[model samples]
Target chain A: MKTINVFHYDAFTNKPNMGNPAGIVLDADGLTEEEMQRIAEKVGFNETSFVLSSEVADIRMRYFTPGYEMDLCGHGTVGTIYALRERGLLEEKASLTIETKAGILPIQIGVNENGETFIKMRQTAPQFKDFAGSKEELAHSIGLEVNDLDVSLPIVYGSTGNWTVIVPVKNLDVCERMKPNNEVFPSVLKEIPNASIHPICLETYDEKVHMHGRHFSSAYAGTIEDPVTGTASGVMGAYYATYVEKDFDHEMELIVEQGQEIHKDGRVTVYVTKDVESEKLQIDIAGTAVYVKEFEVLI
Target chain B: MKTINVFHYDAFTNKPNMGNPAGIVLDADGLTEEEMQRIAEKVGFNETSFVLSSEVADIRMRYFTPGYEMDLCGHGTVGTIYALRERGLLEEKASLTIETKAGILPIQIGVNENGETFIKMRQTAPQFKDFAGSKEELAHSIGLEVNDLDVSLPIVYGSTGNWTVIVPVKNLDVCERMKPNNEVFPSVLKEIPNASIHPICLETYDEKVHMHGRHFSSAYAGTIEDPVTGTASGVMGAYYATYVEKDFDHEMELIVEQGQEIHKDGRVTVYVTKDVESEKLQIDIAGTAVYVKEFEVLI
Candidate 1:
């Protein structure tokens, strides 16, 4: 058996243990899916990443949780870059394109004048599919009733790399205490299909929209709640631009805030655009990632 | 060698891979320092933790970078519980006292009716150490000078588990860009001995005083900047309770908000009380954590 080395890293924040932890595998050209899953189990990260290319900086990559593979992972991708840098494969002041199962994700390498590397990944185009569920369906999935969601925004499905069940709530208290039973996902899926549902409670003013998403996955991909969610925000951005067409421009800049009550203190930028002002349906997501760790995987 | 197993988890947030990551050794007894560090490096989180006392829940722990060891880490303790649960070492819900080199920290574990585990940690008591640096001195150490700091709360050194130079700035832009010359830590240490020097910028509010801290460590800690700083906020709570003693009680409850501008949107409940009310200054910090992922680590 080839020796496989993995390094641990906390992503999204500077403090040692506060942000997202990712497992980085520097080389995995010949590893099978079973082997990758075994490695992820061995690493036991929320997500384990293997770099597919180096010539294009972050040309592309794949992320795996213990049970299955996801279309995209924000924290896992950041963790992947951190592990790559730590292994000395990446130099400071380098930009990369990371290929994942979802799509090609371009990442910008951030550095201070001293050339300390920080990884920033800008996501691909964000798209909102058909409305995922009715108000009753979303409420049931998220442990709330239909009337709780604000009538204006409604519940819709959106995604950047991963799909979310977008539910706008009246206030945070309802969303904060939300505990959707595991039995509800099947019911929620009955209403909204082909989408991994993440309910977001939001209230928007002229200046900013206060937002929070209770993301629970029981489908063997992820089991726990996320303190800060980057993938969820990407979907949220697309939902806002697609459904709530008023007050925001094609070139609208918005901050999808999350992880306050949960205490991860992770921030992700959700930039949406229509190729032009005439086309508001076209949306894209991008955000910066700090280099959290770098290492190697001998497979 | 005795086979040691640790739970892989991200701290600060609930979702496993989204927040910060830390490694927790559920049963760390008989593990040497070298073994612990080796496991931590092998695990590859920014910091790895080990349970010191299995019976009392006072886990002896240490934080480590891939390069070196750290004195303290906030999220490491958070991820430690995830490790405990994943390892099946945690039986029913119970409270635990974490014995560390810093001090004894108590943690409580409980399962909601839904059977999901929840952890709440009582932060160490707050302390307002003597002012350690002048405005100019603090500015020179960091790249910014007078124009950067807010006059309302000048640069002042404070401590709560870790020592940091506090400065409340009016703007978040300055806070984001304020990079300390890491190479000058040795010289900066001369001016302010026995403390981590950085800025704790504050935003004034009628309801509560919002504060943000910029952390820089040449000392091999993980983050260059922290999105939400628990110790800094605790120190801020104590500083305000002491400075504004006339208007409020020595014992004060303040909602210290941080990571808004950056989109992390973290809210920390800081309960502060001075010596007049208690034997020493104390602060209770509380927030929520979300799980991002769960995976088994094969040793």
Candidate 2:
């Protein structure tokens, strides 16, 4: 029996049972691909990550859903870093590069005075495309009325690493009441296969939260309604910098809150930076995570 | 911080990964209902069982899915008993009763020569209901051709405790190819709100197995495709005794196989007995489970 240590962490929340839960297998050495797949399936989380040795980077992280392996998972990585810190495996101000199937990305860790650990992943620049469909059509896809959406803001497709349909809503109340029609929501985005729908508003329930957002994907995806999303928040932060913060300057940080309506509440901090040289928007998704449990498994 | 011990067990299979996975919490006396809900959600299994003290019976078993509490769970009960025996909590041969929201249920535990533990839950007699619709409609509901079904037998609704729409296929290959279209599946069974679709064939891949079955449910229910199921197998056993074994005797035992198409392969042992005095068929769903992992978590 191969005894493996597994850690469960919830990303983007300092409290348990609120954020996106992920499993981190810190020592995935000598485990074959099929073995890793079985481990992730047994974990039964949205995503389970295996930390393996990397020749190019400090470590190699593989992310797998219960069904299949994915190129990259933003929340999974955040949860992995949080679990690592909780094990005292990383320094308070540690910086490392992890090799993923998508690419090698830099990761930074920080510890607060109150013993809160946060991880920041540098995200790529985003490109926004105007939503071809009318606001009514977009609203109908998510099972919302036209009046529930902020018509003044343009609904567009935004992408940092992955494309996300960014929807501007009226207020926090609309965000709370959003019941995404999973069938229509995916088929409407059939043109943009795999793009997640991210509905956001400036009105937030928490005073410190600048943006309130909710995310939903197809029923076949990892999750129906993701609690707190890092990639989606990055895309929304760039959309805010261009459309919502038109009168503002180059750099901004947006504290985005999500998953409250579904009860798994969490907050993501998105830092949007305008590149002086390229005149493009660069983004970083950062968040705190909570430790849930650790398990010893035999395979 | 409450250090609660939790066990992950896969019922209906002797192996580690292939079965209906469930979380078992034996010492759940002090956890509140909401607290139990949180733990079940965090476990992310189809059903998690909490064993508490019972004044009327041996124990009070509370079953919760990832979302909400259910009246009773067959596989969850089996998994809990298997976990108990693994931890030396149960006698070699034990007959016990459990108090559930649905009612009190009798449970039997058996230990083999190799110390393998088995649990048997007494299932209520099934009442078969006519399919009401055409054979074509029933076949189309699960995304199959009318020819794919075993026209020799009847396709109808059978309920041991919960209603399950039973489909009779020609062979195991078609059962392997069963793809339940979720959209049409639930809507077709709109009248039967919480009923599950069970596809079964007399053909078996393993010589010891007598039946091959697969289960699919609505999108809103616990799982899209449940692994090896307990109640559904009991229903299938009763159906076999009625329709397939029309010319045979009443006392029979069936080794049912399921979840192979979806890769979470597991087996269920169903025993059927005829109550000569009452002219009724009595069934018991029994299965073995393997302990996957144990985690100590803070509630």
Predicted structure with the largest lDDT when compared to the true one: 2
lDDT of 1 by residue, A64-180 (tens): 887777667777776667666666776644666665544456776555322444556555466555554456766766677777777777566565556666767777677666666
lDDT per residue (tens digit) for residues A1-299 in model 2: 45667899999998898999989997675454566788888888889998775546677788999899999998999998778767876554568888776778899887642367778899888987877766676788777888898879988888888888999888877776777776666557646746788998888878877888899875468577888889889998888888887656778887889888988779888888878987888899888898899997676
Off by over 4 Å in 1: A1-3, A29-33, A52-60, A86-88, A99-104, A111-126, A129-134, A203-210, A218-222, A248-250, A277-299, B1-299
The list of candidate 2 runs beyond 4 A from truth reads A112-115, B1-299
Q: Estimate each model's TM-score.
A: 0.43, 0.49
- Per-prediction TM-score, chain A only? 0.76, 0.93
> Which stretch of 10 consecutive residues in model 2 chain B shows the poorest summed lDDT?
B185-194
DockQ, 0 to 1 scale, candidate 2: 0.01
Residue A270, model 1: Cα distance from true site in angstroms: 1.1
- Cα deviation at B200, candidate 2, in Å, is 57
* Per-residue accuracy of model 1 over B21-132 as CA lDDT, tens digit each: 5666655543435556777777776667766542223454656665577766666665666567645776565777665556566776665434555455655666554554
- The lDDT, on a scale of 0 to 1, for candidate 1 is 0.59
lDDT of 2 at B189: 65
Candidate 1 residue B81 Cα shift, in angstroms, is: 51
